[PDB]
Every structure is written in C-alpha cells, then in structure tokens.
C-alpha cells in the first residue's frame, strides 16, 4: 500500500 | 541492513542496493586490508543472513 519512492536526476 | 524483501511495489529496494554494497565491500571479490566494522544494533534477528 503506502509506497516510498526513490528518484533520479535529469541533468 | 534489515532482511532483504522481495522486490515489488512496496519493499525496500534502495536501502537494499546499498546493503548489497556493504555486503560485498567487507568480504567481496576484492579483499579488504585493515578495515574493521563495529555495527551496533538492538534487534539481531532482523538483519539479513549475509550480514
């Protein structure tokens, strides 16, 4: 359910 | 370094990829010379068996 999310970085 | 959960929607997958690094750094393809680790925890059953 509750979902922790990572993230990238468009330069 | 809590036990590695099955990759899915909800499951630690980035603290895992850094666990699989420390796991390899300490005893991996490249041996380490003169580095020692003193991890301190409270629950000892919730760590992954590789650690």
């Amino acid at each position: 359910a509750x979902x922790x999310x990572x993230x990238x970085x468009x330069x | 370094g809590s036990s590695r959960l099955e990759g899915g929607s909800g499951g630690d997958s980035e603290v895992q990829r850094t666990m699989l690094e420390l796991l390899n750094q300490l005893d991996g393809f490249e041996a380490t010379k003169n580095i020692k680790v003193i991890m301190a925890t409270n629950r000892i059953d919730i760590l992954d068996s590789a650690l």
Partner: protein, 396 residues
C-alpha cells in the same frame, strides 16, 4: 580487439611451511624482479622529433574532447563540444580520415575548433576501474570440495578458452553465463576469485550496485559500456556479484527511481542475448537469492548453467577445514571430526570463523598451538546469529 589484458600474477611460492625452499623461491622472484627493475630504470638512463613537433604546435595545449557527429566533406566534420553544442570544425591533414567515425571522441583544437586527433580508449573511469589488474590470490586448490560445481564453472569460463576444439568439434556453443546461487557463505565469490587467478582472459568485475547511476541514462549506458569493453578486450568474463541488486522481478512501479533500475536490467537483459548476438564475453553472476531474480535474466540462454552451492556436506566440510587449517599449527590432539560431524548447518564461511576464533582462543591461554578444546569453545563462540530455530518434538 586489443587482446586479453589478463591480470598480472607473480608466480606462486610453495612450500608454505616457511622452509628454506620458500625463501629461495621468493628470492628468485625477487632476483628477476630486481633485474627487471634494473632494465626499466637502466633503459631510461642508458637511453640518452622534427616531424611530430610541428604537429604538436598546430594542436597546442590543451585539446578538447567532443563527439563527432557528421563528416560533411573530406576536410570538414561537425563536432559537438563537451557541453552539447555543435561546431562545423575543419579536419586537418594529420588526423586520420579513417579512424574518424560518427560517435568517436575527437580531439579538438582549443582556439579554433578543428579536428586534431581521435581519442580511442575513452572508456569511462567508472568502467575502467571495473577491470581486474592484480589477479586475486586464491587458486582452485584453495577451494575445497565443489568439484561438481567447479567443473560446471570450468566448462563455461576456462575450458572454452583452452580446448575450443572439443566444443566446435561437437556442435555445442560453449555455455556462456552462469548464475552462482546458494546460501550465504558457501563459496560463491571464492570460486569467482579462483577463476580470475587461473583465467587468461580479461576479468572485469562489478558488484551489482556499481552499475546503477543516478542520472536517467547514466545507468543503462554504463552497462552498454561494460559489455563494450569486455567485447573489446577479446576473451573476457564479467562477474556481476550480488546481481540481486539490479535484476529483481520487474513490476509496475509507481516510482520513477525504480523504473530506471529496471531500465538497466532491461539493458543487461539485451546486452546478453538480443538482436546482434554477442561475441566472446562470458558472464558470471552470483546471488544468494535466486528466487527473486527476474525469470528472464536467468532464462536459459543468458545464464546457461545455474550452479547451485549447497551448504557444505560432511566430506566437503572436512576438506574445507584443512584448506583453512593448512597454515595453522594443530596439536596432535586436534581431531577435527568432533566438530565436522555435527548436524549444525556450518557454512563454509562459518568454518573459517571457527578457525580464526580457535586460533585467537589460543592467544588467550598463551599458546600458538591450538588444542582440541580451542575448537570446541570456538564452535560455540562462532556459531551465533543462527541460534536454534526448529519445530518442537511434534514429529517422531
């Protein structure tokens, strides 16, 4: 094809009992090494221009490195500066209009941008550290047991390079890609460290977490680079240890970060068996959990042999002991069978802790000779983190 840039291993000195046979053999290695240094140093000293010097003057200093994008005329090409701009620079004579290829990294004059040199071998520092130079020091004789597992891992990464005739004389294509899986501490990485100390082919290594960069394309582009170097360097083995970090089961993730890791698995899944088939680049994955890898990344064709490493059996555990108690000094009363026979699931990494501990329990009593009690005590002191978990006396 630069050829296999195999590791650089100094010959091995055995006896290990610290006998004069050992000193002499180390001296011989040293003697030639002292001699070899002599030639290198005495070659610069004993060793005490008008064509290249003109070239270096046209280039000047420094020289930028951008990506070629189009060879407009024979003497004109469009080169993209290191920032992503474009430039209609001029192609000078000294450059080779042959090595100049779209996508090649071109050396550019700094003042008046003009192609001046083609920079081959521009492999990232992030993949040029992946190459193993100093070969690990654990030979196949340091790995005890695992004769069925070793042979399986020696018929995909060693034999297919020494006796190729057997395979091509029979119609097989040498198995290429082996998934070393098993419980933690069984010897997965040691067998890998042993193929590097025997192989004669470039042994690239990764850790399954190195090839996940933060940038959107940094990830899939490092994998496309690693399998470009491994292919470039001819016979090669790429060891992606702890493959579970990148290749876990694909899923509809509502998180962009996790959709870039999978966009890196779906690159390692196509840099192995997809259009434009591979060359000679074997892959040795390792993982303690084969039950979470994507059914495709371990689908026969990419990982042909799934070597399974069970916890040591009683005969192997007895051989594992000696390989780690070879250099030790056991007293006459050290009959190892007392510890081996136990039904405790003593892994192969447990055995080397029951050896480090039983040798440190010797310093406690001021002894460099470990008696039989030094193992009994050590077995308990080294056997935690697994306690005792099982069913009650239900089953008879």
């Amino acid at each position: 094809t630069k050829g296999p840039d195999a590791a650089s291993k100094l010959p091995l000195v055995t006896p290990h009992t610290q006998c004069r046979l050992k000193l002499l053999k180390l001296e011989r290695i040293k003697d030639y090494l002292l001699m070899e240094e002599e030639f290198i140093r005495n070659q610069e000293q004993m060793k005490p221009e008008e064509e290249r010097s003109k070239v270096d003057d046209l280039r000047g200093t420094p020289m930028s490195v951008g990506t070629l994008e189009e060879i407009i005329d024979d003497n004109h090409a469009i080169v993209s500066t290191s920032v992503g701009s474009e430039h209609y620079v001029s192609i000078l004579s000294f450059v080779d209009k042959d090595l100049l290829e779209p996508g090649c990294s071109v050396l550019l004059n700094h003042k008046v941008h003009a192609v001046i040199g083609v920079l081959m071998d521009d492999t990232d520092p992030l993949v040029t550290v992946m190459k193993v130079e100093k070969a690990p020091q654990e030979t196949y004789a340091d790995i005890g047991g695992l004769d069925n597992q070793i042979q399986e891992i020696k018929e995909s990464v060693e034999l297919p390079l020494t006796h190729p005739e057997y395979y091509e004389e029979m119609g097989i294509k040498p198995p290429k890609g082996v998934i070393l899986y098993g419980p933690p501490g069984t010897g997965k990485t040691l067998l890998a460290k042993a193929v590097a100390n025997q192989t004669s082919a470039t042994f690239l290594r990764v850790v399954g977490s190195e090839l996940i960069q933060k940038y959107l394309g940094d990830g899939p582009k490092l994998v496309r680079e690693l399998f470009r170097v491994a292919e470039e360097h001819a016979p090669s083995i790429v060891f992606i240890d702890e493959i579970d970090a990148i290749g876990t089961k694909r899923y509809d993730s509502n998180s962009g970060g996790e959709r870039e890791i999978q966009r890196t698995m779906l690159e390692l899944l196509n840099q192995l068996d997809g259009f434009d088939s591979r060359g000679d680049v074997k892959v040795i994955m390792a993982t303690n959990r084969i039950e979470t890898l994507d059914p495709a990344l371990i689908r026969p064709g990419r990982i042909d042999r799934k070597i399974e490493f069970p916890l040591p059996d009683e005969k192997t555990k007895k051989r594992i002991f000696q390989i780690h108690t070879s250099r030790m000094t056991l007293a006459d009363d050290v009959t190892l069978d007392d510890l081996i026979m136990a039904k405790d699931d003593l892994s192969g990494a447990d055995i080397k802790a029951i050896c480090t501990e039983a040798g440190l329990m010797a310093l406690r009593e001021r002894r460099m000779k470990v008696t039989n009690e030094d193992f009994k005590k050590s077995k308990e002191n080294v056997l935690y983190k697994k306690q005792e978990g099982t069913p009650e006396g239900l089953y008879l």
